[PDB]
Amino acid sequence: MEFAFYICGLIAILATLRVITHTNPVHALLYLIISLLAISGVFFSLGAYFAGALEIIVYAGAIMVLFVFVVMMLNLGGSEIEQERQWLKPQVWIGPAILSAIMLVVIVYAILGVNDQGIDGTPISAKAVGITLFGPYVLAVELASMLLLAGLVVAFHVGREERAGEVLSNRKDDSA
């Protein structure tokens, strides 16, 4: 459990850094999937068996698939932005990095001053979560369907193509 938490916790931080600093979009997504698998191990180490599985079933097996689909559809990668590698230029990342560092320091300070009896790791099952979802949190599940419906309707409205054909040519203003 302890090894799993620290090893997976470290695999995640290292992979996440590779993602934000990578030039190749697909490689960045690969390191992002690696970090999601690492976070799934952290979830399992803490006893969150349901969250654990969902981390791989929905986040690294659906949301990420959609991202790869888009990168492969628009043939992303090798763009002037990813060729200039501006993010690597120190004058571009030093400022943002310092703001993030100060935010982390302040947050960590607050965390270090909290009561900590420790996380036992007793497994919380998906059955227990389901009893809660269809018991005290019933309105959440019903309204969550409406939220996903809104995503479906909006994504279709702005994501639908006006030009028919599996292969389309990139025209300015998508002129037909």
């Binding site: 947050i107 005290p136 309105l139 959440a140 419906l149 279709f156 409205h157 702005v158």
Partner: protein, 485 residues
């Protein structure tokens, strides 16, 4: 708690709007019909407004651990339903010129309204988190409904990315609050802390990260840079909803949170909220002083009006008029905003591409659209807070709550901010009666649907004036709508 037959009556508004979302979607499935689908949406939203009567007769009750139905919930539910019916009446004339799928607009307005009703009854952090997303995700599509327009796409991309960032700060903050509390209910946030121990570092840090998310949605400095760009890019019908429903729905849940949460009476949070209010009141008016775009001007205006409301929140744990002030102020802001944004919608309908957003377009409105100029004048005076308008009665409440709470720096800001505001509000008002010989103005549509929008902005102006001279009726209703403490 479980869902008893009695609990189900208190959910009528949420259940009716939800059923409307389904029936309208099944109607679009059967056959796209702009008139029928718009009509079905309006009928469902009205039915929900009428159901509020039955909810009131039933009485205050906590349906589940996530929702508490009381007078406050009914009042804010009514406000969101009114601002949403208006959005629909203003959309039909505009969507008539939209040569593309138009039934989905009403479908999204309904789901966003469901978010506001949830936020009105929200008594749990989960409800707060879900309600904001139910009122934000539909708006991403509404702000970018005319994706073919460059400004509408820019507005949608800006809102989506910034709202997503704001939702992560909110969730992370709620997680840190949970790590210290152990309960996600508002009444338990700060309850486990002992005497003089309320300022627990992590509890304060969680609230601080939650304020970044809530402050963004309420366009409060320093999370306000998005307001002018999104308000201008979003289609005019949508701008009306973003300026009214979202702000009123989210400001209300924040009031309930700082009222029920024991940590709400933290001086550190109060002093931080006070700096945000002062900046929002001064920065909003100062940035609107030189605006030549009415949409951007009304954006900066929202920054200041929300700053005025925050003063009542800062004086919440010191008086009882604080809740009454916000109710009266938000009622006035609703009618005043529906009036100004609605006139912009009618002058931008039918959709012909870019909206009439330049102040030059309104430089002789009276000599073409007399009643529309008169309404805009009344709303400009109301938003300025000029006695004889409901806007002033809202400002009076804020100043009274502030004085009773000795918020002298904030009361001084309201006076300086209002003085700065008079310059731009009056400029837009007097402009309507100037003579613009240049007439590139488009002819008004001639259908009862367009005339209905004109009635909405007219009735809203009449209410702003009648309640501006005789406010006791509204004061009595808002006083009945009190949270179940």
């Amino acid at each position: 708690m479980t869902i008893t037959p009695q609990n189900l009556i208190a959910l009528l508004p949420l259940l009716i709007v939800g059923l409307t979302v389904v029936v309208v979607m099944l109607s679009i499935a059967w056959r796209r019909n702009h008139f029928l689908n718009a009509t079905l949406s309006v009928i469902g939203l009205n039915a929900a407004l009428v159901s509020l009567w039955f909810v009131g007769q039933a009485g205050a009750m906590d349906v589940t651990p996530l929702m508490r139905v009381d007078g406050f919930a009914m009042l804010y539910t009514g406000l969101v339903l009114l601002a949403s019916l208006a959005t629909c009446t203003f959309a039909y004339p505009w969507l008539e010129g939209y040569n593309d799928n138009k039934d989905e607009f009403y479908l999204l307005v309904l789901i966003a309204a469901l978010g506001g009703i949830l936020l009105a009854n929200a008594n749990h952090l989960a409800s707060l988190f879900l309600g904001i997303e139910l009122i934000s995700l539909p708006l991403f599509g509404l702000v970018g409904y005319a994706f073919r327009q460059k400004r509408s796409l820019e507005a949608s991309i800006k809102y989506t990315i910034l709202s997503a960032a704001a939702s992560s700060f909110l969730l992370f903050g709620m997680a840190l609050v949970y790590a210290q509390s152990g309960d996600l209910s508002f009444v338990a946030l700060g309850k486990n802390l002992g005497d003089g121990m309320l300022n627990e570092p992590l509890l304060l840090a969680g609230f601080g990260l939650m304020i970044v998310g809530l402050g963004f949605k309420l366009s409060l400095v320093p999370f306000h840079l998005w307001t002018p760009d999104v308000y201008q890019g979003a289609p005019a019908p949508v701008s009306t909803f973003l300026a009214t429903a979202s702000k009123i729905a989210i400001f209300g849940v924040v009031m309930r949170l700082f009222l029920y949460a024991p940590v709400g009476d933290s001086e550190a949070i109060r002093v931080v909220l006070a700096i945000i209010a002062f900046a929002s009141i001064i920065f909003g008016n100062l940035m609107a002083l030189s605006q030549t775009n009415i949409k951007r001007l009304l954006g900066y205006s929202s920054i200041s009006h929300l700053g005025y409301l925050l003063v009542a929140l800062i004086a919440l744990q010191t008086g009882e008029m604080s809740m009454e002030a916000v109710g009266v102020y938000l009622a006035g802001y609703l009618f005043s905003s529906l009036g100004a944004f609605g006139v912009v919608s009618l002058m931008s309908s039918p959709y012909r591409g870019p909206d009439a957003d330049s102040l030059f377009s309104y430089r002789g409105l009276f000599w073409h659209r007399p009643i529309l100029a008169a309404v805009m004048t009344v709303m400009m005076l109301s938003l300025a807070g000029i006695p004889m308008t409901l806007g002033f009665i809202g400002k009076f409440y804020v100043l009274a709550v502030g004085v009773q709470a000795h918020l002298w720096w904030l009361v001084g800001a309201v006076v300086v901010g209002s003085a700065i505001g008079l310059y731009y509000y009056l400029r837009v008002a007097v402009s309507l009666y100037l003579h613009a010989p240049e007439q590139p103005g488009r002819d008004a549509p001639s259908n009862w649907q367009y005339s209905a929008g004109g009635i909405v902005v007219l009735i809203s102006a009449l209410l702003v004036l009648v309640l501006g001279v005789w406010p006791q009726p509204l004061i009595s209703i808002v006083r009945l709508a009190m949270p179940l403490m």
